[PDB]
Amino acid sequence: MLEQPYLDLAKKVLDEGHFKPDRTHTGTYSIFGHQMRFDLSKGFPLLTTKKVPFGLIKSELLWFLHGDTNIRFLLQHRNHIWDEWAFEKWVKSDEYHGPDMTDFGHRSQKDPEFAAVYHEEMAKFDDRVLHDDAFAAKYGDLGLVYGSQWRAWHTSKGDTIDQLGDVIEQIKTHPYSRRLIVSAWNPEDVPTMALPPCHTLYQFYVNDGKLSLQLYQRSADIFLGVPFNIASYALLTHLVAHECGLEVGEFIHTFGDAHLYVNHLDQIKEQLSRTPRPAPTLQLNPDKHDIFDFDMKDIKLLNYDPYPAIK
Amino acid sequence: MLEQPYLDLAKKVLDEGHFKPDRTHTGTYSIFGHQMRFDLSKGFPLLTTKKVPFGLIKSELLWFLHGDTNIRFLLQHRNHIWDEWAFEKWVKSDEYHGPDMTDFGHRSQKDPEFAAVYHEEMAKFDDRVLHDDAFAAKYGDLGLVYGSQWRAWHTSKGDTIDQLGDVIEQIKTHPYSRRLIVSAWNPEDVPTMALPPCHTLYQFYVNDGKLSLQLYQRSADIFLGVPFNIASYALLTHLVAHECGLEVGEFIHTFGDAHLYVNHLDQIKEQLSRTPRPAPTLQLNPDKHDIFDFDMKDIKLLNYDPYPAIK
Ligand SMILES: Cc1cccc2c1C(=O)N(c1ccc(C(=O)O)c(O)c1)C2=O
Ligand SMILES: Cc1cccc2c1C(=O)N(c1ccc(C(=O)O)c(O)c1)C2=O
Ligand SMILES: O=c1ccn([C@H]2C[C@H](O)[C@@H](COP(=O)(O)O)O2)c(=O)[nH]1
Ligand SMILES: O=c1ccn([C@H]2C[C@H](O)[C@@H](COP(=O)(O)O)O2)c(=O)[nH]1
């Protein structure tokens, strides 16, 4: 089945992973250099063995594809997956006049006391960002995230480059180029930025009218992140293939470090008892082609039949 | 044997490669996303099935490690592997007063007539570059090659960053970092530069006192380039491991496109009839540690017993 490489990776890290102490007084088990492949003609690799929310992936990917780094767009699609790094930058600032909450993320899931205070502070933030243009401009904007690396890379001359747009034009004119690359790794920013990008770089390749994509992912939360990551890049691959009029090939997912947190062990063991079902199919607006203008409604997933979400 | 992944890759491209017409009126056979691993504790992966010149690899790597982009240093070590792209930039200029030779590389191996004229023009160039500081400054310097990307990455603020030096300091202080990355891919230069780097990016990883390295290589001449490429990065891995006081782990070699030219087919078939021998061993100066100061003599290869070179 389409998703077996994900289960084999999880099982391999479980049975052969190396232990490393981790920053947040925990530990990981990891392996280096693992690869997964997914033939996208066999179905869409959204995990059946655990429910993965396709709507959040769609909206995040469309966000990136607009070159947008303002969480407002995500709030408008009911997507809170980027909230915390923005919440973090406002809560660290001068304009902020509520409870203390230094590292709200550690104290996050502990006492039910603070966890009611924070959830309302985040609920106010979200709403300010939604309706207050000036507040949104100031705290809604994450700065150096995928939207900017992919579509507005900042050059030394103060200008800005659309790597992905230029790449797509190359697929259309020079399909056999060996330079169909988009990087998110900027050696000038990486020493200071909040989040050196985990999805480091990717490359397309065309053969027999089919478009493949390989992603190099320097670091991977196998349980929480990977299942989202697989679906974003498989969707990216279909969307680019659609805009270029090509069929879809492989998605190849290559890791630097892939890890499992030492407290998440039983959740993934439980998942490894489940048996994949047939994979969903994707449908894209057959009459639209500029993916930089696609919206939620232009992307549909048929026949997705997952086991339940895990906690 | 240590080198079998190289022979399996060659054989896979031979038996399952996709044909693509190539720029220089030829064609390649290629595959996308292939990986090779080499456990560096089992020996040094310099190919036994074809002689590969370790001295040229050593000198090229030391060049990179100085942050140097002037071919003069290479000329002084009897290494001509970068000559042509420099020869190309002087022969295209105003100061040049010899025979015409537009695309000397196509006319290169054809008629023995021009091939005597060019070899002497290249022999004069090399000697000027060697003894004429001003000429060397002007035509010896390739500009954006590995030396500059790795050790003097140009920032927007007009400054310059030593990615590799900073990475090595991180290995020493934060060995379990998931950010031990050096990129050679600069989205601002890549649209114009002569040679968008083939050795796109690499990452280290440490476990149990052993240092591993993974390289992402976006494009690969399986017959001519790969055997050099494998030895440079395996040597890089040993050198960094030496400076940091670690043992050596895996070298993982991951490709975007890996190809074989459609006229090089029988050379690689002939090589596939040969049987690997035990791999050489590397010895490094046990009393020196700053690899940015290493020289030829600090690196020794024992017991390298190859079949003959191929043409
Ligand atoms: C699954 C997931 C889904 C949507 C968005 C994000 C993730 C995710 O894991 N991170 C993320 C980004 C950066 C870091 C980091 O600290 O470097 C992190 O731990 C998580 C996201 O922004
Ligand atoms: C095996 C090899 C050994 C040393 C140096 C070089 C190579 C090599 O293949 N190229 C190279 C670089 C760039 C291109 C390019 O045209 O992009 C190329 O064809 C070869 C080198 O500079
Ligand atoms: O799409 C993503 C983005 C991030 N991560 C994880 C990997 C790491 O656990 C964490 C970042 O910590 P560092 O590796 O960057 O130090 O984010 C994912 O799994 N998938
Ligand atoms: O270390 C290297 C450097 C380059 N190449 C080859 C791959 C391609 O044949 C060629 C560059 O052409 P493009 O792929 O860049 O277009 O250089 C290698 O095999 N090894």
Curated annotation (Swiss-Prot), chains A, B:
Gene Ontology cellular component terms for the protein in this record: cytosol
Listed pathway(s): Pyrimidine metabolism; dTTP biosynthesis
Pfam families (alphabetical): Thymidylat_synt (PF00303)
UniProt KW Cytoplasm keyword: yes
InterPro entries: Thymidate_synth/dCMP_Mease (IPR045097), Thymidate_synth/dCMP_Mease_dom (IPR023451), Thymidate_synth/dCMP_Mease_sf (IPR036926), Thymidylate_synthase (IPR000398), Thymidylate_synthase_AS (IPR020940)
Subcellular location: Cytoplasm
Enzyme Commission numbers on file: 2.1.1.45
Catalytic activity, as annotated: dUMP + (6R)-5,10-methylene-5,6,7,8-tetrahydrofolate = 7,8-dihydrofolate + dTMP
Residues binding dUMP, per UniProt: 23, 178-179, 218-221, 229, 259-261
One function term, GO molecular function aspect: thymidylate synthase activity
Active site, UniProt feature: 198
A GO biological process held by the record: methylation
Binding site for (6R)-5,10-methylene-5,6,7,8-tetrahydrofolate: 221
Key words of the record: Cytoplasm, Methyltransferase, Nucleotide biosynthesis, Transferase
Family from the record: Belongs to the thymidylate synthase family. Bacterial-type ThyA subfamily.
PANTHER family according to UniProt: THYMIDYLATE SYNTHASE (PTHR11548:SF9), THYMIDYLATE SYNTHASE 1 (PTHR11548)
Function: Catalyzes the reductive methylation of 2'-deoxyuridine-5'-monophosphate (dUMP) to 2'-deoxythymidine-5'-monophosphate (dTMP) while utilizing 5,10-methylenetetrahydrofolate (mTHF) as the methyl donor and reductant in the reaction, yielding dihydrofolate (DHF) as a by-product. This enzymatic reaction provides an intracellular de novo source of dTMP, an essential precursor for DNA biosynthesis.
Complexes and interactors: Homodimer.
Protein known as: Thymidylate synthase
Biological classification of the source: Bacteria, Bacillati, Bacillota, Bacilli, Lactobacillales
